[PDB]
Amino acid sequence: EDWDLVQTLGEGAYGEVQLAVNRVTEEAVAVKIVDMNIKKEICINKMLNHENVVKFYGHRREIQYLFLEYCSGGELFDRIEPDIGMPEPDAQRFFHQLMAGVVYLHGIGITHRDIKPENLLLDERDNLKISDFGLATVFRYNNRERLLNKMCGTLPYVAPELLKRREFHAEPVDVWSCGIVLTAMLAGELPWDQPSDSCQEYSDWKEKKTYLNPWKKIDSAPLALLHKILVENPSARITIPDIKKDRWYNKPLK
Ligand SMILES: O=c1[nH]cnc2sc3c(c12)CCCC3
């Protein structure tokens, strides 16, 4: 082909992700290599078009190769200093972009199911892009909502209902994991291993022990939002349109 695999960008799972550069136009893109879920990832990618979602260029199979937008900014994960987090103004901006990305996905009945800082990429202007749809699934089709039942995700970003219920709504699960992401951004640590009662840290949160880490590192305005997102009852949990009206979310930041 006309593309040279310059270097490995990401690794693990089905295949490593590599940076390809066109030796003619010289445009750079990302190439995901998978050797035989992948069918659904491609299908889903075809539906997506948003400036806060990693662009899908197209695909070819020599082992399937997917051409994705290249984010030179790397992953959000690497903008979080451990135990510190990041300046609140950057966190808010990143959160606003994450919300737009998610509103969009949910708007077309798609749930990501694995929202975490490793999957939130940054472009050259530090714009955030939702990445990897290999675990994404349809939760609304023909205006009909389907509850989920398969357990997906990453334990620290996972919502509690997903551990204790046979079926659950998709949207609040993505909302929960965005809250865990906000926590990571403002405190540089994850609150718990998983959201179960067997887990001391989660039990402490439910009891409102905000004088513990990581909550003590978080200003009271964002923390009030986190109080509304990390609500155990997925029916009580704040929804995105209501997040959009939250005081911290609308607070101008230096
Ligand atoms: O730039 C990308 N574009 C599309 N997918 C991916 S995955 C990955 C990146 C990337 C770059 C940082 C290392 C991890």
Q: Atom 3, ligand 1: which residue's CA is nearest?
A: 70
Check residue 13 and give left, alpha or beta (phi > 0: left; psi -120 to 50: alpha).
left
Distances (CA, A) of 117 to 62, 88, 92, 183: 31, 16, 14, 11
CB 54 near ligand 1, within 6 Å: yes
Query: 207 alpha carbon to ligand 1 midpoint, in Å?
Result: 39
Report the C-alpha gap between 179 and 227 in whole angstroms. 9
Give the residue carrying structure tokens 């892009």: 129
Domain range list for the chain? 1-81, 82-254
**Domain 82-254 falls in which CATH fold?**
Transferase(Phosphotransferase); domain 1 (1.10.510)
Report the C-alpha gap between 94 and 75 in whole angstroms. 12
Burial class (CB in 10 A: 0-12, 13-18, 19+), 121: buried
User: 157: annotated binding-site residue?
Assistant: no
What was the structure determination method? X-ray
Report the C-alpha gap between 111 and 152 in whole angstroms. 11
Residue among 68, 114, 118 to mutate when testing ligand 1 (max atoms within 8 A of CB) = 68
Q: In the chain, count H helices and then E strands.
A: 7, 11
Q: How far apart are the first and last CA of the chain?
A: 47
Query: 9 alpha carbon to ligand 1 midpoint, in Å?
Result: 6
Report the C-alpha gap between 236 and 228 in whole angstroms. 8
User: 13: annotated binding-site residue?
Assistant: yes
Long-range contact list for 242-251, CB < 8 A, 24+ apart?
243/99, 243/175, 244/99, 247/221, 248/92, 248/221, 248/222, 248/224, 249/92, 249/95, 249/96, 249/225, 251/92, 251/221
Burial class (CB in 10 A: 0-12, 13-18, 19+), 24: exposed
Report the C-alpha gap between 230 and 245 in whole angstroms. 17
User: 11: annotated binding-site residue?
Assistant: yes
Determine whether domain 1-81 maps to CATH 3.40.50.300: no
Give the residue carrying structure tokens 């039942």: 149
